[PDB]
Amino acid sequence: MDIISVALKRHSTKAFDASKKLTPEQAEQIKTLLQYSPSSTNSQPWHFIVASTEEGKARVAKSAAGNYVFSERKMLDASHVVVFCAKTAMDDVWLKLVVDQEDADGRFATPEAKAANDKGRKAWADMHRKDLHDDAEWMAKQVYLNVGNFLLGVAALGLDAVPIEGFDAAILDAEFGLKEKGYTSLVVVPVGHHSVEDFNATLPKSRLPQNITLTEV
Amino acid sequence: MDIISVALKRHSTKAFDASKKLTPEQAEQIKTLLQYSPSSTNSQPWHFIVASTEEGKARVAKSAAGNYVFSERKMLDASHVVVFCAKTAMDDVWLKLVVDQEDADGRFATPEAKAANDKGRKAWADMHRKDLHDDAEWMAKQVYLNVGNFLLGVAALGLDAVPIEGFDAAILDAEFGLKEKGYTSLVVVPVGHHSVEDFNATLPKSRLPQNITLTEV
Numbered sequence A, B: 001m002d003i004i005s006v007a008l009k010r011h012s013t014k015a016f017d018a019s020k021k022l023t024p025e026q027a028e029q030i031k032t033l034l035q036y037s038p039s040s041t042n043s044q045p046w047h048f049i050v051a052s053t054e055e056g057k058a059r060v061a062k063s064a065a066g067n068y069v070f071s072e073r074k075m076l077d078a079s080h081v082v083v084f085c086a087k088t089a090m091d092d093v094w095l096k097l098v099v100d101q102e103d104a105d106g107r108f109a110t111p112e113a114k115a116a117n118d119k120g121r122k123a124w125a126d127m128h129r130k131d132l133h134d135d136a137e138w139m140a141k142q143v144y145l146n147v148g149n150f151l152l153g154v155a156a157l158g159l160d161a162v163p164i165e166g167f168d169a170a171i172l173d174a175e176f177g178l179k180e181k182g183y184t185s186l187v188v189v190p191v192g193h194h195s196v197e198d199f200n201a202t203l204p205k206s207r208l209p210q211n212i213t214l215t216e217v
């Protein structure tokens, strides 16, 4: 299609049709979107939990307790549910893992280029984790970037979705043991196909006018 | 479908052709992407600076002069340069603006619906600004989401781009007086067409394997 049409037509679904599942290919395609998102210094400071089974989605849905009950059925009724997670701290093993992967994929012709790349990444990494002490926040920003890429991507696939911040991160982290693995949950994105109960599918889209939000120079 | 090819083929441009400019329509399409990105509670906590003139781009490139000379080159050679900014504090004036805009767009059927929507947004707002004291970080995350949406969008438009954290936001804020207007710069994204010196255009893309970053349940 035309990507502008996608952006103007996509929406946050508030009700999914539990009967409509992702095709096997679509399930793979959304995982490709998660993987190939850009990130600062290609740090890829993230982990994804993709729930497709009834039990899997139920476990994620435990995070929608208390004041977050309105998002529970969205997690349950959707075909697939993606939990976007950020690393809790930027460690050297991860930095080594990323540059070795780039080396393996053939982005360096000389060991000097590889050394240059690695040391440049460590500079920014250290700037955040030793100078500004905001590496946790800095990595979370990269994940939200991934989310933005993902929402546009699935919409272009003709898939319905909704990003969710309305959940208990503490419960969700505990359910999948994320703290001990070095991650924390940030956004939950159910994906599938909306039902007729989705009031947001027929409502007009609303954004602030550009004269307020945008300045041209 | 199509979008996956876009996700696999896009790349961060390392060198722009200073002779290739966006068409007037492409200029409009870029601003459409900025405007219609989703955000938590549709809070839209952002401002955009789109530099299309050489004087405008030079003002932006000031943030990269000296300690970010390679970033500075990309800002100067690219056709359009978008500066993503976040609100420094979520205030009641903005919350009112958002809900009045949604009202003006006919999203509410009853005055009660507007009051409910309004109370819901202020609840999450208060949670961040008063309980968690992280409304600045919360709003910054939404802007990064907008960037993620933007990069995929412009790639699908067949345009080259690169997200840039390598700049001095202090200098950039001072140049446009963002602080006093209630904003701060986060990410700069030059947009245009790459040149022959863009080595990254013919390098293989590198990402961590899914058996490291992704868990299926």
Ligand SMILES: Cc1cc2nc3c(=O)[nH]c(=O)nc-3n(C[C@H](O)[C@H](O)[C@H](O)COP(=O)(O)O)c2cc1C
Pocket: A010, A011, A012, A013, A014, A071, A162, A163, A164, A165, A166, A167, A187, A200, A205, B037, B038, B039, B040, B041, B042, B145
């Ligand atoms: C970070 C983020 C978190 C969100 N969390 C929720 C949520 O918890 N519940 C919900 O119904 N919608 C949630 N949304 C969807 C927003 O309400 C929606 O993006 C906004 O109203 C704009 O409407 P649109 O996405 O249909 O264009 C979230 C969106 C974002 C970007």
Ligand SMILES: Cc1cc2nc3c(=O)[nH]c(=O)nc-3n(C[C@H](O)[C@H](O)[C@H](O)COP(=O)(O)O)c2cc1C
Pocket: A037, A038, A039, A040, A041, A042, A145, B010, B011, B012, B013, B014, B071, B162, B163, B164, B165, B166, B167, B187, B200, B205
């Ligand atoms: C938040 C952010 C900031 C970035 N800043 C820079 C930058 O300052 N200079 C640069 O050359 N690339 C920058 N990049 C591009 C990354 O290097 C690039 O996205 C990553 O290496 C993956 O490569 P790809 O975008 O070509 O797929 C940035 C990317 C992101 C997401």
